[PDB]
Amino acid sequence: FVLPATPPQLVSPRVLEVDTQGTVVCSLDGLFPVSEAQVHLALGDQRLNPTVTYGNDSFSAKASVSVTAEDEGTQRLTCAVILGNQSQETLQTVTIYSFPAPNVILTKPEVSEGTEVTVKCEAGPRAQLLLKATPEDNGRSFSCSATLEVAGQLIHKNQTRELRVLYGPRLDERDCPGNWTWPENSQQTPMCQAWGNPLPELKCLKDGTFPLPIGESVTVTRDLEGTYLCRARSTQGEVTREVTVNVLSP
Ligand SMILES: *[C@@H]1O[C@H](CO)[C@@H](O)[C@H](O)[C@H]1NC(C)=O
Ligand SMILES: *[C@@H]1O[C@H](CO)[C@@H](O)[C@H](O)[C@H]1NC(C)=O
Ligand SMILES: *[C@H]1O[C@H](CO)[C@@H](O)[C@H](O)[C@H]1NC(C)=O
């Protein structure tokens, strides 16, 4: 056999978090018979199970490693290639750290338009973010970002959380006009839109059953004429508006 006196190439992250998985790769060439060599990979007191891949008088051993709280601190990663009574070994360090997630603390996750909202992180003066919730905030996300120093390397970790804002049903004269005057047989598009979260259910009825074709283009007919009661209700309340359609002679 032939096992040159040089350490195997060892690739691994110099840093690894608790309860996460890592990947080590050891390789070496110029040895023979590679198929008979024993590859010893291990981090600390944990012996790894590598997947050895052979090549032109060479090999590459890949292995995954999982760490826990007990392994916290500096651990030793080793790769040893053995043939006969000779062995080539490489020593490296891997630091296991614990970085608690910076949780986003929302006073109240779901709130109604107008309420005061406070945002703080929890994992020198204490800072919080205050803002008066607006409807434009429904679905928006607040974040808590943090950094940690481990082995001269800067690790980043964050957390985002969405805020649900609720805004009562609304029917401004602007987005749902109180009256219409259309010439019989003209083309129009009845306009009446409710506003709110949750999205309010809208119904514009005349004589309690005849609906106004809102949002769509229609041909004005005699039977559109009348008074409609547009109701927009949701768990946040209910708003009623009366709409009058006049249908002039063509
Ligand atoms: C061994 O090396 C020679 C030179 O590249 C090549 O002809 C042969 O295919 C190689 N076998 C491998 C890649 O294992
Ligand atoms: C938080 O980290 C994620 C990676 O999971 C990244 O995509 C995002 O930009 C970060 N958010 C911020 C800017 O706090
Ligand atoms: C290695 O050492 C063992 C133990 O004495 C010996 O029996 C074996 O022949 C040696 N093989 C070599 C030269 O690597």
Curated annotation (Swiss-Prot):
Glycans are attached at N56, N85, N158, N179. Monoubiquitinated, which is promoted by MARCH9 and leads to endocytosis. Disulfide bonds join C26-C79, C121-C144, C176-C192, C204-C230. Induction: Up-regulated by coagulation factor Xa (F10) in atrial tissues. Up-regulated in atrial tissues by rapid pacing resembling atrial fibrillation. Residues 19-86, 114-151, 185-237 form the Ig-like C2-type domain. It is found in: Membrane. ICAM proteins are ligands for the leukocyte adhesion protein LFA-1 (integrin alpha-L/beta-2). During leukocyte trans-endothelial migration, ICAM1 engagement promotes the assembly of endothelial apical cups through ARHGEF26/SGEF and RHOG activation. (Microbial infection) Acts as a receptor for major receptor group rhinovirus A-B capsid proteins. Homodimer. Interacts with MUC1 and promotes cell aggregation in epithelial cells. Interacts with ARHGEF26/SGEF. Interacts (on T cell side) with CD81, CD247 and CD9 at immunological synapses between antigen-presenting cells and T cells. (Microbial infection) Interacts with major receptor group rhinovirus A-B capsid proteins. Belongs to the immunoglobulin superfamily. ICAM family. This is Intercellular adhesion molecule 1. It comes from Homo sapiens (Human).
